[PDB]
């Protein structure tokens, strides 16, 4: 599924995303809209073997399993097919547990180049939430 800009961002605020660890759901948007284009089916290969999985873009180096990156874990305990799933609540879910590791947002690379520091609120202006 291809979200809307606005669709997506009220899914994500529904499933507690909006200020989740300080980041206002602007920035959700913003790097749901660069690593994924609001499709939920978004898959890309990373040069190490790893994939990234759906609208978040979420690595199976670390946190899914896709039964082909060795030596890799699966932290969010799903298969990485669940993140590609039309529904976000396990992209959610899965990226509450690696903005809370840490690193906060800056593990989403596209996030820390293309969104952070910009003004975030631009992508949820004129949406009903
Ligand atoms: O910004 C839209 C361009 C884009 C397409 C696919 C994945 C990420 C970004
Ligand atoms: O108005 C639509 C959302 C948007 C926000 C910031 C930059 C380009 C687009
Ligand atoms: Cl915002
Ligand atoms: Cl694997
Ligand atoms: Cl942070
Ligand atoms: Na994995």
Same mark, same amino acid.
């Given at each position: ?9 009220? #899914? ?6 909006? $200020? *989740?660890?300080? *980041?206002?759901?602007? $920035? +959700?948007?913003? @790097? ?5 284009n609001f499709n939920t089916? #978004? !898959?890309?290969? $990373?040069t190490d073997g790893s !994939?990234?999985?759906?609208? &978040? ?5 670390? +946190?899914?399993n896709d039964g082909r990156? %060795?030596?890799?874990?699966? =932290?969010?305990?799903? %298969?990485?097919? @669940? =993140? &590609?799933?039309? /529904?976000?609540?396990?992209?959610? $879910? ?13 593990? +989403?690379? #596209? +996030? ?6 910009? /003004?975030?609120? @631009? ?5 009903? &939430?």
């Open positions: 599924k291809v979200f809307g800009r606005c669709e997506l961002a009220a #899914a994500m605020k529904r499933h507690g995303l909006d $200020n *989740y660890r300080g *980041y206002s759901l602007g $920035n +959700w948007v913003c @790097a749901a809209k660069f690593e994924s089916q #978004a !898959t890309n290969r $990373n !994939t990234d999985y759906g609208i &978040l873009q979420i690595n199976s180096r670390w +946190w899914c990156t %060795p030596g890799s874990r699966n =932290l969010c305990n799903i %298969p990485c097919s @669940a =993140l &590609l799933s039309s /529904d976000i609540t396990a992209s959610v $879910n899965c990226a509450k547990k690696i903005v809370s590791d840490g690193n906060g947002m800056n593990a +989403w690379v #596209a +996030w820390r180049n293309r969104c952070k520091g910009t /003004d975030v609120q @631009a992508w949820i202006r004129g949406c009903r &939430l």
